[PDB]
């Protein structure tokens, strides 16, 4: 965008005139700029001055502005809006733009996928951290055999009482039996004593009832 010189252009645009009027006064101003950059090369001499040249230049400028005003014709109120067109029948760079737009779609999906993955991982870490501070016990091991081959030890401790009771039975039976043994030994001793009684009585029977009375006389 090369632009220099006296300028007074570009940014300096009147707003009270239409774009056709704008370009017309642009033409006009360029016309004076041409006049002033062509004038210095001329020199004044006797019987020669610049009034005719400047008058004909001014008349030409008036003709120019009239020509521009005639050219600004168009449809009624057609300048209120602008015009825009273009042809896009076929191209390859448009196909490249489209495909790289599906690449945009792929990266946009990747954005949300990555966000979901990182959120899931971080929330799982936080959940585990919170949970840490806040049947199967027998099976699933290699030594289920020693567990499932277990006899009832309560049964053994109960059979201890049965053994004690059996000894109670047996030994009190022994007590009773030996008491019977005493009761029979006493009966046998009584038999011995009583039989000795009648044998002694029969021996005494033929003895003198009062031998000393027969002894004295």
């Amino acid at each position: 965008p090369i632009h220099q010189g006296i300028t007074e252009l570009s940014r300096s645009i009147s707003v009270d005139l239409a774009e056709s009027k704008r370009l017309g006064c642009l033409l006009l101003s360029s016309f004076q700029f041409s006049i002033q950059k062509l004038e210095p090369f001329l020199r004044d001499t006797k019987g020669f001055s610049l009034e005719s040249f400047r008058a004909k230049a001014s008349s030409l400028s008036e003709e120019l502005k009239h020509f521009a005003d005639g050219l600004e014709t168009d449809g009624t109120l057609q300048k209120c809006f602008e015009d825009s067109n273009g042809k896009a029948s076929d191209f390859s760079l448009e196909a490249s733009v489209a495909e790289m737009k599906e690449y945009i779609t792929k990266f946009s999906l990747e954005r949300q996928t990555w966000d979901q993955l990182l959120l899931h991982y971080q929330q799982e870490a936080k959940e585990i951290l919170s949970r840490g501070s806040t049947p199967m016990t027998y099976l699933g091991s290699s030594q289920n055999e020693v567990l499932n081959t277990k006899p009832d030890y309560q049964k053994i401790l109960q059979n201890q009482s049965k053994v004690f009771d059996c000894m109670e039975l047996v030994m009190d039976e022994l007590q009773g039996s030996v008491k019977q043994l005493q009761a029979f030994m006493d009966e046998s001793t009584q038999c011995f004593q009583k039989v000795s009684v009648q044998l002694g009585k029969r021996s005494m029977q033929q003895l003198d009832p009062s031998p000393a009375r027969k002894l004295l006389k």
Partner: peptide, 10 residues
Amino acid sequence: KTELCTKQAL
């Protein structure tokens, strides 16, 4: 876990 539980039972 089940091995440690078996240890406790043993």
